[PDB]
Amino acid sequence: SIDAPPSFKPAKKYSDVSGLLANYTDPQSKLRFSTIEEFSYIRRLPSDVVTGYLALRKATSI
């Protein structure tokens, strides 16, 4: 019963592939990104590293 409580505030949304603030999330891969060059970059990734990034955030990915 020493565990700290859950946070009250909603979480900030940083981009996966660079860590910069992300206004945007891609509807198909479900990764999140900051700029146009990052959206060009993510679309060229294989499925393995995509699920690899989502697994850092215990997202739907299992």
Partner: peptide
């Protein structure tokens, strides 16, 4: 290593960089 050299230390202040929902060293 750019942004990565910040995102690794910050975990104890924002555990939500991982999946984990806990208050972190600030809200606690």
């Amino acid at each position: 290593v750019g942004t990565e050299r910040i995102r690794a230390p910050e975990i104890i202040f924002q555990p939500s960089l991982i999946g984990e929902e806990q208050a972190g060293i600030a809200e606690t």
